[PDB]
Design a protein around this motif. Structure first.
Motif, PDB file in Angstrom:
ATOM      1  N   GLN A 161      -3.345   0.410  -8.258  1.00 37.65           N
ATOM      2  CA  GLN A 161      -3.171   0.399  -6.820  1.00 37.65           C
ATOM      3  C   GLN A 161      -2.010  -0.511  -6.464  1.00 37.65           C
ATOM      4  O   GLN A 161      -1.811  -1.550  -7.095  1.00 37.65           O
ATOM      5  CB  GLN A 161      -4.431  -0.093  -6.116  1.00 37.65           C
ATOM      6  N   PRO A 162      -1.222  -0.146  -5.462  1.00 41.94           N
ATOM      7  CA  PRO A 162      -0.069  -0.971  -5.098  1.00 41.94           C
ATOM      8  C   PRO A 162      -0.489  -2.382  -4.736  1.00 41.94           C
ATOM      9  O   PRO A 162      -1.654  -2.650  -4.440  1.00 41.94           O
ATOM     10  CB  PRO A 162       0.514  -0.240  -3.884  1.00 41.94           C
ATOM     11  N   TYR A 163       0.478  -3.285  -4.762  1.00 36.47           N
ATOM     12  CA  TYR A 163       0.264  -4.674  -4.394  1.00 36.47           C
ATOM     13  C   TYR A 163       1.514  -5.147  -3.685  1.00 36.47           C
ATOM     14  O   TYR A 163       2.604  -5.126  -4.266  1.00 36.47           O
ATOM     15  CB  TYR A 163      -0.016  -5.545  -5.615  1.00 36.47           C
ATOM     16  N   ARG A 164       1.366  -5.532  -2.426  1.00 40.93           N
ATOM     17  CA  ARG A 164       2.493  -6.080  -1.700  1.00 40.93           C
ATOM     18  C   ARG A 164       2.630  -7.551  -2.047  1.00 40.93           C
ATOM     19  O   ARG A 164       1.633  -8.266  -2.196  1.00 40.93           O
ATOM     20  CB  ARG A 164       2.312  -5.879  -0.199  1.00 40.93           C
ATOM     21  N   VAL A 165       3.871  -8.004  -2.185  1.00 46.36           N
ATOM     22  CA  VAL A 165       4.155  -9.325  -2.715  1.00 46.36           C
ATOM     23  C   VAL A 165       5.233  -9.967  -1.861  1.00 46.36           C
ATOM     24  O   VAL A 165       6.246  -9.330  -1.543  1.00 46.36           O
ATOM     25  CB  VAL A 165       4.600  -9.262  -4.186  1.00 46.36           C
ATOM     26  N   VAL A 166       5.008 -11.225  -1.494  1.00 47.48           N
ATOM     27  CA  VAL A 166       5.968 -12.046  -0.775  1.00 47.48           C
ATOM     28  C   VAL A 166       6.172 -13.328  -1.567  1.00 47.48           C
ATOM     29  O   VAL A 166       5.203 -14.001  -1.938  1.00 47.48           O
ATOM     30  CB  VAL A 166       5.499 -12.360   0.655  1.00 47.48           C
ATOM     31  N   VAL A 167       7.431 -13.667  -1.813  1.00 48.38           N
ATOM     32  CA  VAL A 167       7.800 -14.818  -2.620  1.00 48.38           C
ATOM     33  C   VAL A 167       8.707 -15.707  -1.787  1.00 48.38           C
ATOM     34  O   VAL A 167       9.715 -15.244  -1.243  1.00 48.38           O
ATOM     35  CB  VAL A 167       8.492 -14.388  -3.923  1.00 48.38           C
ATOM     36  N   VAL A 169       1.895  -7.678 -11.350  1.00 48.85           N
ATOM     37  CA  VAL A 169       2.003  -8.818 -10.439  1.00 48.85           C
ATOM     38  C   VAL A 169       2.125 -10.114 -11.223  1.00 48.85           C
ATOM     39  O   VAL A 169       2.790 -11.057 -10.780  1.00 48.85           O
ATOM     40  CB  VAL A 169       0.814  -8.863  -9.459  1.00 48.85           C
ATOM     41  N   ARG A 170       1.498 -10.183 -12.398  1.00 39.27           N
ATOM     42  CA  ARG A 170       1.619 -11.357 -13.249  1.00 39.27           C
ATOM     43  C   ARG A 170       3.059 -11.634 -13.651  1.00 39.27           C
ATOM     44  O   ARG A 170       3.404 -12.789 -13.914  1.00 39.27           O
ATOM     45  CB  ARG A 170       0.751 -11.188 -14.495  1.00 39.27           C
ATOM     46  N   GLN A 171       3.908 -10.609 -13.694  1.00 38.07           N
ATOM     47  CA  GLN A 171       5.272 -10.810 -14.156  1.00 38.07           C
ATOM     48  C   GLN A 171       6.139 -11.538 -13.142  1.00 38.07           C
ATOM     49  O   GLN A 171       7.276 -11.891 -13.468  1.00 38.07           O
ATOM     50  CB  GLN A 171       5.897  -9.465 -14.520  1.00 38.07           C
ATOM     51  N   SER A 178      -6.102 -18.070   4.711  1.00 43.67           N
ATOM     52  CA  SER A 178      -6.345 -16.680   5.079  1.00 43.67           C
ATOM     53  C   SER A 178      -7.408 -16.026   4.209  1.00 43.67           C
ATOM     54  O   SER A 178      -8.210 -15.233   4.716  1.00 43.67           O
ATOM     55  CB  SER A 178      -5.046 -15.882   4.991  1.00 43.67           C
ATOM     56  N   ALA A 179      -7.422 -16.330   2.910  1.00 42.98           N
ATOM     57  CA  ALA A 179      -8.407 -15.793   1.969  1.00 42.98           C
ATOM     58  C   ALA A 179      -8.403 -14.268   1.936  1.00 42.98           C
ATOM     59  O   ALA A 179      -9.355 -13.645   1.462  1.00 42.98           O
ATOM     60  CB  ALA A 179      -9.813 -16.312   2.278  1.00 42.98           C
ATOM     61  N   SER A 180      -7.335 -13.654   2.440  1.00 43.69           N
ATOM     62  CA  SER A 180      -7.144 -12.216   2.340  1.00 43.69           C
ATOM     63  C   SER A 180      -6.341 -11.817   1.111  1.00 43.69           C
ATOM     64  O   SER A 180      -6.583 -10.741   0.553  1.00 43.69           O
ATOM     65  CB  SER A 180      -6.449 -11.680   3.601  1.00 43.69           C
ATOM     66  N   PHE A 181      -5.406 -12.652   0.670  1.00 39.89           N
ATOM     67  CA  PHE A 181      -4.554 -12.363  -0.472  1.00 39.89           C
ATOM     68  C   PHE A 181      -5.348 -12.500  -1.759  1.00 39.89           C
ATOM     69  O   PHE A 181      -5.889 -13.569  -2.054  1.00 39.89           O
ATOM     70  CB  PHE A 181      -3.358 -13.308  -0.512  1.00 39.89           C
ATOM     71  N   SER A 182      -5.411 -11.417  -2.531  1.00 42.09           N
ATOM     72  CA  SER A 182      -6.126 -11.457  -3.797  1.00 42.09           C
ATOM     73  C   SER A 182      -5.301 -12.063  -4.923  1.00 42.09           C
ATOM     74  O   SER A 182      -5.668 -11.906  -6.091  1.00 42.09           O
ATOM     75  CB  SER A 182      -6.577 -10.051  -4.193  1.00 42.09           C
ATOM     76  N   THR A 183      -4.198 -12.741  -4.606  1.00 42.41           N
ATOM     77  CA  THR A 183      -3.419 -13.475  -5.596  1.00 42.41           C
ATOM     78  C   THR A 183      -2.552 -14.502  -4.888  1.00 42.41           C
ATOM     79  O   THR A 183      -1.687 -14.138  -4.089  1.00 42.41           O
ATOM     80  CB  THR A 183      -2.541 -12.536  -6.429  1.00 42.41           C
ATOM     81  N   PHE A 184      -2.776 -15.781  -5.175  1.00 41.16           N
ATOM     82  CA  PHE A 184      -2.004 -16.825  -4.515  1.00 41.16           C
ATOM     83  C   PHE A 184      -1.685 -17.960  -5.476  1.00 41.16           C
ATOM     84  O   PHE A 184      -2.569 -18.759  -5.799  1.00 41.16           O
ATOM     85  CB  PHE A 184      -2.769 -17.364  -3.310  1.00 41.16           C
ATOM     86  N   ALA A 197       0.307 -12.335  -3.119  1.00 38.86           N
ATOM     87  CA  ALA A 197       0.168 -10.935  -3.468  1.00 38.86           C
ATOM     88  C   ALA A 197      -1.175 -10.433  -2.978  1.00 38.86           C
ATOM     89  O   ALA A 197      -2.222 -11.022  -3.264  1.00 38.86           O
ATOM     90  CB  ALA A 197       0.299 -10.716  -4.975  1.00 38.86           C
ATOM     91  N   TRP A 198      -1.135  -9.329  -2.236  1.00 37.03           N
ATOM     92  CA  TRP A 198      -2.358  -8.760  -1.695  1.00 37.03           C
ATOM     93  C   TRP A 198      -2.387  -7.265  -1.952  1.00 37.03           C
ATOM     94  O   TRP A 198      -1.360  -6.579  -1.902  1.00 37.03           O
ATOM     95  CB  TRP A 198      -2.514  -9.058  -0.203  1.00 37.03           C
ATOM     96  N   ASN A 199      -3.590  -6.772  -2.240  1.00 37.18           N
ATOM     97  CA  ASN A 199      -3.798  -5.359  -2.499  1.00 37.18           C
ATOM     98  C   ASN A 199      -3.296  -4.554  -1.313  1.00 37.18           C
ATOM     99  O   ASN A 199      -3.356  -5.012  -0.170  1.00 37.18           O
ATOM    100  CB  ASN A 199      -5.275  -5.073  -2.756  1.00 37.18           C
ATOM    101  N   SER A 200      -2.791  -3.359  -1.591  1.00 37.53           N
ATOM    102  CA  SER A 200      -2.183  -2.508  -0.581  1.00 37.53           C
ATOM    103  C   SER A 200      -2.607  -1.058  -0.751  1.00 37.53           C
ATOM    104  O   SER A 200      -1.930  -0.148  -0.275  1.00 37.53           O
ATOM    105  CB  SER A 200      -0.662  -2.625  -0.621  1.00 37.53           C
ATOM    106  N   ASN A 201      -3.730  -0.826  -1.434  1.00 39.67           N
ATOM    107  CA  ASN A 201      -4.245   0.532  -1.547  1.00 39.67           C
ATOM    108  C   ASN A 201      -4.631   1.085  -0.184  1.00 39.67           C
ATOM    109  O   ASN A 201      -4.913   2.281  -0.053  1.00 39.67           O
ATOM    110  CB  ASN A 201      -5.444   0.565  -2.493  1.00 39.67           C
ATOM    111  N   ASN A 202      -4.662   0.228   0.838  1.00 38.25           N
ATOM    112  CA  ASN A 202      -4.929   0.680   2.194  1.00 38.25           C
ATOM    113  C   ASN A 202      -3.907   1.700   2.676  1.00 38.25           C
ATOM    114  O   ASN A 202      -4.253   2.870   2.862  1.00 38.25           O
ATOM    115  CB  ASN A 202      -4.924  -0.519   3.141  1.00 38.25           C
ATOM    116  N   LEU A 203      -2.653   1.288   2.843  1.00 37.82           N
ATOM    117  CA  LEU A 203      -1.603   2.145   3.371  1.00 37.82           C
ATOM    118  C   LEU A 203      -0.781   2.836   2.305  1.00 37.82           C
ATOM    119  O   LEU A 203      -0.738   4.066   2.272  1.00 37.82           O
ATOM    120  CB  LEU A 203      -0.635   1.335   4.239  1.00 37.82           C
ATOM    121  N   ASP A 204      -0.150   2.066   1.424  1.00 40.38           N
ATOM    122  CA  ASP A 204       0.962   2.510   0.598  1.00 40.38           C
ATOM    123  C   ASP A 204       0.623   3.665  -0.329  1.00 40.38           C
ATOM    124  O   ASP A 204       1.526   4.196  -0.978  1.00 40.38           O
ATOM    125  CB  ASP A 204       1.498   1.332  -0.212  1.00 40.38           C
TER     126      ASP A 204
END
Ligand SMILES: *[C@@H]1O[C@H](CO)[C@@H](O)[C@H](O)[C@H]1NC(C)=O
Ligand SMILES: *[C@@H]1O[C@H](CO)[C@@H](O)[C@H](O)[C@H]1NC(C)=O
Ligand SMILES: *[C@@H]1O[C@H](CO)[C@@H](O)[C@H](O)[C@H]1NC(C)=O
Ligand SMILES: *[C@@H]1O[C@H](CO)[C@@H](O)[C@H](O)[C@H]1NC(C)=O
Ligand SMILES: *[C@@H]1O[C@H](CO)[C@@H](O)[C@H](O)[C@H]1NC(C)=O
Lengths: 597, 194
Positions: B174-180, B75-77, B39-45, B103-110
């Motif tokens: 800026q917020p960061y949405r995270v899925v684990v 997000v590092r934690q 996807s190359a959209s997530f700024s942390t993988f 983890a992807w940046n979420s300054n868009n909506l949140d």
């Protein structure tokens, strides 16, 4: 269970509160500062009052924690800075009296105005009227009139006002176990509870008087040279041994001497170094200047500006549609927002001020990791020093040629370097006697060492004995001429400039010695030398979580303010002045007067 | 045969705050993590244990997808062997971790001007969390010795505090949405692969 862990918990709540509220307050103040309207004033004042009320409430709630029961010095420092209620300790009537007198003095100074006896309707605020009057008008009588008029109009007003303010503030300080308000200010450098690094408040006075004693020769020879030149400019007014009359100091008071440069430049036929034309002839605008300064700061390994700075800040004046009071400032809105507010006119002076403010921004970016209360300078002087060193390191001819902004074949010589150092010493070396004299006078006032009806009698004394200044008009005790200044009237600490000046050259010399620069200190540039970069970052990343002496030795290897880097930097100028002064008496008599002849 | 519902979880419109990190179970489906990886959209993988390619052709019994919102720096934690507010009080990763972290940046909506106060995190706790335990309580914190009985005051603290998300924050705020994601293998057949 103990006191330590409970204070930990408390401060851990106080952070995540004050961060949010400070963001609201600072963001509202920013919105006001770029777009001057009424509703912005409303939002800013409401958010600011909310923040201040939160701070007062939190100080009161925090004083329930016993200080001496704390060992971990980070927690002790935060608790000490927080628990200091300050003016919140007085009786409420007295507090309103303080706010009253403060607002009266501040507004009187901010709106006071003057005009000649001929047109009582055509008259001027100091800025820019009296400003340019003292800055560029060469008419002796005109300048003397400006001098006496501004010293009489606000001085007599605030004189008894400042008496009362001194009384109330002495009470405010004595309330919190501070012997007087002077000591309250000096309590910023105070360090205790750290072996080999402690610093007492009187130790500060000792150090400052010491350093001034050693600077005295350089300033004395500078004053000799400038007196000679001004005699060559106004012979009918100056004594070949008498002190310098203040109303010729290129300003209403002489905070700097910059405006004497053209009047005293040695080699008046030498084309001064100025890249203004070279800048405009290459289509240089705001974005370009700031990208260049950012590239500078990347050259020494410091990190570069996050995108928020490029997106949000105001680099270009917002046209004529909306107005802003753009004194060039750098803003740390907290939580990772950094901005700069500046109407950049494309010149050289602005190309230096951009480096200065971006250095402020770098210093603020450095310690975003320290907890809230420590996000500040290690003392009241590191910010402006970290700012100034970058400007003086990027104003060197070598660096200017490095970016191609200067003709690569401009040849450095004795003449141009003496001109450069004279410009510098007129900016920096000239302001140290003034700063020290004023702060010492204010300290002595606060210590009660002077009867009130004698203040002015003592004041111009010290200038006559320190800054080589003599008043052209006898001023009696009804004036409060110091109050006619910004900081005196607005109650700001004034020695932070002295500490800035000296820490500046300590930092500069240490950084150059970290870049293995060979040659005179002034031609030094720190660019491309990541060693000096890391050496400075190791002091930046601390904040005030350590005693300032420790962060100072982390760089300059010394434990105290020390003039020797200044004299090292100015050595060539000092030699040249020693040559030029063989035909003039160095020093001044204390009895010659311009009004009692 | 039917595709795993990574869609409805990965980019729905409203994520659950960290202290109530929304958990979703994945089973009885076929999974295609290739679009995820490329996807190359997530700024942390980042993840620990399996190769991002090999996991495509591997079968597991059950999968768990935790999802929440956090700050930038923090997000590092989210990593086996870290410590901090998110790893101490709000979320726990066991050092024998098996999934992946996205983890992807979420300054868009949140975030929205004036502050978006719908996102919360637990600021205080008597003890650190166990792996994969979620605590939703809000009992006032006994910071001192005197009990509080549900009142805010000296040594009596509220255990939830709100992320002051705004759009003008630095990258670390800026917020960061995270899925684990985590996988588990048991005796039953592995109903999750593709
Ligand atoms: C300046 O403030 C006014 C008053 O709120 C507002 O209408 C205007 O949009 C502001 N300027 C800009 C550029 O937003
Ligand atoms: C002091 O407290 C900080 C956290 O507030 C901690 O990181 C540090 O280790 C403590 N100092 C000592 C000596 O334990
Ligand atoms: C800062 O410099 C680094 C150098 O590697 C670069 O990768 C980064 O993109 C720069 N920052 C910005 C905002 O361009
Ligand atoms: C710094 O290094 C760069 C690349 O090596 C070079 O282009 C530039 O001229 C150098 N500047 C100075 C002041 O050494
Ligand atoms: C959901 O949409 C966002 C925004 O386009 C995208 O970044 C993300 O990759 C999408 N989810 C998946 C699983 O591709």
């Amino acid at each position: 269970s103990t006191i330590e862990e409970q204070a930990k918990t408390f401060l851990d709540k106080f952070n995540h509160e004050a961060e949010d509220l400070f963001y609201q307050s600072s963001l509202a103040s920013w919105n006001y500062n770029t777009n001057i309207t009424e509703e912005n004033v409303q939002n800013m004042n409401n958010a600011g009052d909310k923040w201040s009320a939160f701070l007062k409430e939190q100080s009161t709630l925090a004083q329930m924690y016993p200080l001496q029961e704390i060992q971990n010095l980070t927690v002790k420092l935060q608790l000490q800075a927080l628990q200091q209620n300050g003016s919140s300790v007085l009786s409420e009537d007295k507090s309103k009296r303080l706010n009253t007198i403060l607002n009266t003095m501040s507004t009187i100074y901010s709106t006071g105005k003057v005009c000649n006896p001929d047109n009582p309707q055509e008259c001027l605020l100091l800025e820019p009227g009296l400003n340019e009057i003292m800055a560029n008008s060469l008419d002796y009588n005109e300048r003397l009139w400006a001098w006496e008029s501004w010293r009489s109009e606000v001085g007599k007003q605030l004189r008894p006002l400042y008496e009362e303010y001194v009384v109330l503030k002495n009470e405010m300080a004595r309330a919190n176990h501070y012997e007087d308000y002077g000591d309250y200010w000096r309590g910023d450098y105070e360090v205790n509870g750290v072996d080999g690094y402690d610093y007492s408040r009187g130790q500060l006075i000792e150090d400052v008087e010491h350093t001034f004693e050693e600077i005295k020769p350089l300033y004395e020879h500078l004053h000799a040279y400038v007196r000679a030149k001004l005699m060559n400019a106004y012979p009918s007014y100056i004594s070949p041994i008498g002190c310098l009359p203040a109303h010729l100091l290129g300003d209403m008071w002489g905070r700097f001497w910059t405006n004497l440069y053209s009047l005293t430049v040695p080699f008046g036929q030498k084309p001064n170094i100025d890249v203004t034309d070279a800048m405009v002839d290459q289509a240089w605008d705001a974005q370009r200047i700031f990208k260049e300064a950012e590239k500078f700061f990347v050259s020494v390994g410091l990190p570069n500006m996050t995108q928020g700075f490029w997106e949000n800040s105001m680099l270009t004046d917002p046209g004529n549609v909306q107005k802003a009071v753009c004194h060039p400032t750098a803003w740390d809105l907290g939580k990772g927002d950094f901005r700069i507010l500046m109407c950049t006119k494309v010149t050289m002076d602005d190309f230096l001020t951009a480096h200065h403010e971006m250095g402020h921004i770098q210093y603020d970016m450095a310690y975003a990791a320290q907890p809230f209360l420590l996000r500040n300078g290690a003392n009241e002087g590191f910010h402006e020093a970290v700012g100034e060193i970058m400007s003086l390191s990027a104003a060197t001819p070598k660096h200017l040629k490095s970016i191609g902004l200067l003709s690569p074949d401009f040849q450095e010589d004795n003449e141009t370097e003496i001109n450069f150092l004279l410009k510098q010493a007129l900016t920096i070396v000239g302001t140290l006697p003034f700063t020290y004299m004023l702060e010492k006078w204010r300290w002595m006032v606060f210590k009660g060492e002077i009867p009130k009806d004698q203040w002015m009698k003592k004041w111009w004394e010290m200038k006559r004995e320190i800054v080589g200044v003599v008043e052209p008009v006898p001023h009696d005790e009804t004036y409060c001429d110091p109050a006619s200044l910004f900081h005196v009237s607005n109650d700001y600490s004034f020695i932070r400039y002295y500490t800035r000046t000296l820490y500046q050259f300590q930092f500069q010399e240490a950084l150059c010695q970290a870049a293995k620069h060979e040659g005179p200190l002034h031609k030094c540039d720190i660019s491309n030398s990541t060693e000096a970069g890391q050496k400075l970052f190791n002091m930046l990343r601390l904040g005030k979580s350590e005693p300032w002496t420790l962060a100072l030795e982390n760089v300059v290897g010394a434990k105290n303010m020390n003039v020797r880097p200044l004299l090292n930097y100015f050595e060539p100028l000092f030699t040249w002045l020693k040559d030029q002064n063989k035909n003039s008496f160095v020093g001044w008599s204390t009895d010659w007067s311009p009004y009692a002849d | 045969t039917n595709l795993c519902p990574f869609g409805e979880v990965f980019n729905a419109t409203r994520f659950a705050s960290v202290y109530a990190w929304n958990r979703k179970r994945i089973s009885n489906c076929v999974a295609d993590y290739s679009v995820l990886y490329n996807s190359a959209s997530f700024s942390t993988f980042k993840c620990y244990g399996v190769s991002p390619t090999k996991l495509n052709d591997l079968c597991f019994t059950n999968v768990y997808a935790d999802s929440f919102v956090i700050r930038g720096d923090e997000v590092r934690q989210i990593a086996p062997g870290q410590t901090g507010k998110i790893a101490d009080y709000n979320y726990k990763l066991p050092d024998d971790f098996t999934g992946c972290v996205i983890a992807w940046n979420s300054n868009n909506l949140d975030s929205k001007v004036g502050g978006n106060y719908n996102y919360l995190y637990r600021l205080f706790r008597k003890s650190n969390l166990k792996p994969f335990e979620r605590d939703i309580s809000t009992e006032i914190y006994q910071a001192g010795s005197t009990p509080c009985n549900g009142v805010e005051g000296f040594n009596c603290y509220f255990p939830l505090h709100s992320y002051g998300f705004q759009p003008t924050y630095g990258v670390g705020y800026q917020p960061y949405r995270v899925v684990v994601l985590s996988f588990e293998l048991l005796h039953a057949p592995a109903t999750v692969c593709g």
